[PDB]
Amino acid sequence: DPFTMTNPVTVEVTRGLLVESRHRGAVAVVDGDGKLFFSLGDIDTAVFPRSACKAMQALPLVESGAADAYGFGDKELALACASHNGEEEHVALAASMLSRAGRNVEALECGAHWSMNQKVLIQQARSLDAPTALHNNCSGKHAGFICACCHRDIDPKGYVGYEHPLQVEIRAVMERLTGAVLGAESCGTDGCSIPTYAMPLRNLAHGFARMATGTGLEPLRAKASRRLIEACMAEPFYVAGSGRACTKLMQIAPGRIFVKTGAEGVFCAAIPEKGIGISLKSEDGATRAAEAMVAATLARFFETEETVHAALMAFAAMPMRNWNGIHVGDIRATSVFSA
Amino acid sequence: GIDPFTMTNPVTVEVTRGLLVESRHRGAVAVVDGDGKLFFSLGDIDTAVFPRSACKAMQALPLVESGAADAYGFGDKELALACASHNGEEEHVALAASMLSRAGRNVEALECGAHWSMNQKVLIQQARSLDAPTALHNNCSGKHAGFICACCHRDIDPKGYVGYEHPLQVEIRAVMERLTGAVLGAESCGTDGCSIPTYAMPLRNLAHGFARMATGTGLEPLRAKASRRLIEACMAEPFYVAGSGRACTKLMQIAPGRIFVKTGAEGVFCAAIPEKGIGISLKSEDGATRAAEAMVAATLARFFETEETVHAALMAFAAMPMRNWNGIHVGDIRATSVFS
Numbered sequence: 001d002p003f004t005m006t007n008p009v010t011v012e013v014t015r016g017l018l019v020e021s022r023h024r025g026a027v028a029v030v031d032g033d034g035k036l037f038f039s040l041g042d043i044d045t046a047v048f049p050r051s052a053c054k055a056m057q058a059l060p061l062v063e064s065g066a067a068d069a070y071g072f073g074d075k076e077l078a079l080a081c082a083s084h085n086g087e088e089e090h091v092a093l094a095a096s097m098l099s100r101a102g103r104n105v106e107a108l109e110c111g112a113h114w115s116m117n118q119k120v121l122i123q124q125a126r127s128l129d130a131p132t133a134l135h136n137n138c139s140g141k142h143a144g145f146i147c148a149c150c151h152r153d154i155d156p157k158g159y160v161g162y163e164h165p166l167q168v169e170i171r172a173v174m175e176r177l178t179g180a181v182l183g184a185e186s187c188g189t190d191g192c193s194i195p196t197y198a199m200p201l202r203n204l205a206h207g208f209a210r211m212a213t214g215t216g217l218e219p220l221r222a223k224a225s226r227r228l229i230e231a232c233m234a235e236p237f238y239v240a241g242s243g244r245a246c247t248k249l250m251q252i253a254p255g256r257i258f259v260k261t262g263a264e265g266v267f268c269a270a271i272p273e274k275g276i277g278i279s280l281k282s283e284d285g286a287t288r289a290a291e292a293m294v295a296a297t298l299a300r301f302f303e304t305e306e307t308v309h310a311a312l313m314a315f316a317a318m319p320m321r322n323w324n325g326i327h328v329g330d331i332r333a334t335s336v337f338s339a
Numbered sequence: 340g341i342d343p344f345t346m347t348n349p350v351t352v353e354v355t356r357g358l359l360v361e362s363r364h365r366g367a368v369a370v371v372d373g374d375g376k377l378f379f380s381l382g383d384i385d386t387a388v389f390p391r392s393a394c395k396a397m398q399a400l401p402l403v404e405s406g407a408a409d410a411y412g413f414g415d416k417e418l419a420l421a422c423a424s425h426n427g428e429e430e431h432v433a434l435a436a437s438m439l440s441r442a443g444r445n446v447e448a449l450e451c452g453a454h455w456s457m458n459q460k461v462l463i464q465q466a467r468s469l470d471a472p473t474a475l476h477n478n479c480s481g482k483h484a485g486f487i488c489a490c491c492h493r494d495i496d497p498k499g500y501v502g503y504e505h506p507l508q509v510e511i512r513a514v515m516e517r518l519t520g521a522v523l524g525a526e527s528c529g530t531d532g533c534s535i536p537t538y539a540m541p542l543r544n545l546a547h548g549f550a551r552m553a554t555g556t557g558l559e560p561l562r563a564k565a566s567r568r569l570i571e572a573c574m575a576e577p578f579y580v581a582g583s584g585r586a587c588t589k590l591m592q593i594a595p596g597r598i599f600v601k602t603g604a605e606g607v608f609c610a611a612i613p614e615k616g617i618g619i620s621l622k623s624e625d626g627a628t629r630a631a632e633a634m635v636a637a638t639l640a641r642f643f644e645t646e647e648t649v650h651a652a653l654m655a656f657a658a659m660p661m662r663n664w665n666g667i668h669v670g671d672i673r674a675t676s677v678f679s
């Protein structure tokens with residue numbers, strides 16, 4: 001009988017001299033042609049990408065012509081690809097995207113939530129009675145969905161539904177990019193009420209490598225993919241925002257590194273100039289582990305660019321300080337990433 | 340005297356989405372009776388684990404044994420707060436402030452630092468009413484008020500009470516060694532979130548320590564009495580141990596007066612069932628609170644299988660639904676069959 005191997009320990013969290021907690025996980029690094037550069041752990045069992053694949057889901061917004069018809073630039077494209085903090089800049093831009101399609105917050109079907117970022121949440125609490133759908137981290141993606149529908153005269157009502165034309169189109173796009181089979185059996189409902197399709201990490205990484213390089217893509221999809229990847233790297237605040245790893249990681253080497261977090265410990269990334277796509281998951285779903293793992297994986301490709309490498313290693317290995325500012329331990333990606 | 344077998348910890352908690360397991364947690368559980376006999380276990384219960392806040396009731400023994408709690412007229416709410424990782428609600432803050440003032444001190448005596456509530460609803464209330472939190476809002480402020488009170492009652496200068504060789508920390512090591520039978524020293528010590536020592540020890544020893552506090556077995560009369568007072572106070576005033584929305588408080592409302600529980604940072608739980616002579620400790624390998632919560636409920640449930648209403652209420656913590664922002668059920672967080 002075959003079985004699945006136990007995932008290796010990818011991240012340790014120390015206190016004093018001891019490992020206090022440990023995370024296991026898996027990483028796939030795939031080039032534009034589909035060759036596996038590097039991997040750790042189980043890259044074949046299907047994993048939910050959650051928000052990490054928002055740039056794939058943003059392809060309808062661009063390919064439909066809607067982004068151009070509505071005058072969207074890199075900030076709107078980045079927001080369409082974002083799990084944003086719900087800061088005022090994000091909420092205003094989502095509202096503007098909807099308004100250009102003749103719609104408003106009432107068209108959003110994602111629901112509302114308070115910021116998961118503590119400083120932004122404090123700001124929101126002090127200025128709002130309750131968040132609205134615009135504050136949802138997925139509001140730019142859903143504004144992008146609504147814009148793709150309205151530009152094409154598709155009724156956006158029910159755009160979250162499995163057989164709404166928008167979800168039909170997103171399945172076709174993601175199957176083409178990743179080569180995975182996306183069906184009801186491997187589908188769940190995402191935090192924002194749209195389908196999320198579990199697929200192998202190997203396929204997810206391959207899909208990001210294709211977006212990053214154009215390999216295997218028809219001309220319009222290759223061009224739209226470049227636009228999205230470049231918009232995210234050009235306006236990284238709009239992908240995440242203040243205090244956030246995705247934003248800071250895309251400020252290390254401006255215009256060269258694409259990253260995107262997903263809920264439950266997922267990260268996707270790409271390095272266009274190296275032809276590389278990356279996907280990963282921390283087995284237990286911890287964000288702190290996925291962040292350390294994506295920085296340590298990226299660092300493998302910048303070892304001779306000392307300033308970039310040092311900045312990535314500062315996310316791969318990070319100090320923890322207590323409320324008095326005393327160093328108590330570290331969160332560190334393990335040696336499997338440098339071997 | 341060869342070395343024990345190494346172990347990979349089993350999957351104790353699954354998090355599903357749709358038809359699939361989305362995330363998984365591994366961990367370990369020790370259940371020990373008052374005599375030190377191992378009653379049930381899963382995973383590695385012998386490698387040292389930091390208990391973090393889960394052992395606050397052990398650290399509260401100086402407050403009671405010194406005579407300070409009685410000298411200051413404290414009741415169960417103050418004892419519970421001394422044992423608490425509280426939410427920083429107004430009642431917790433006011434009670435820590437009055438424990439300090441009854442000892443002739445104030446917020447400036449606290450050496451733990453300040454933080455915003457880890458509970459989101461309380462955070463929102465704090466943000467709307469405060470420019471910044473103070474040390475009284477720290478989840479450990481009742482414990483640290485207890486420390487300061489223990490010092491002041493005995494005319495021990497509380498300044499520097501976080502330090503490794505302050506008399507209070509010397510006393511805490513002696514208490515915790517007696518209760519747990521573990522060796523506590525600098526090599527197995529770290530600094531806690533509140534700046535005091537935290538000592539790694541095997542889950543087996545931590546569970547035994549809670550079984551001893553719960554039963555009195557192996558303890559001298561004053562320590563057995565003080566331990567009863569602390570465990571009873573937590574069960575009597577469980578809001579003061581944690582607060583609104585919190586697992587420790589809700590778990591202590593299932594079977595009033597019968598189940599003691601306490602969370603610790605990084606996925607630790609300790610528990611006791613005094614009437615059954617049982618102490619419990621556990622850790623999620625990755626540190627996730629959601630896993631530790633499911634594990635403590637599934638472990639407790641094994642002791643109440645013939646008490647259907649208590650069992651059902653515990654099972655609702657062992658397997659909990661997850662809903663998205665629209666209220667749609669997306670999956671569940673469930674303790675696995677290793678608990679059966």
Ligand SMILES: [Cl-]
Binds near residue numbers: 192661
């Ligand atoms: Cl969700």
Ligand SMILES: [Cl-]
Binds near residue numbers: 218221222
């Ligand atoms: Cl294509």
Ligand SMILES: [Cl-]
Binds near residue numbers: 320321322533
């Ligand atoms: Cl800490």
Ligand SMILES: [Cl-]
Binds near residue numbers: 517557558562563
């Ligand atoms: Cl004793």
Ligand SMILES: [Zn+2]
Binds near residue numbers: 051138141190191192
């Ligand atoms: Zn979403």
Ligand SMILES: [Zn+2]
Binds near residue numbers: 531532
């Ligand atoms: Zn503490």
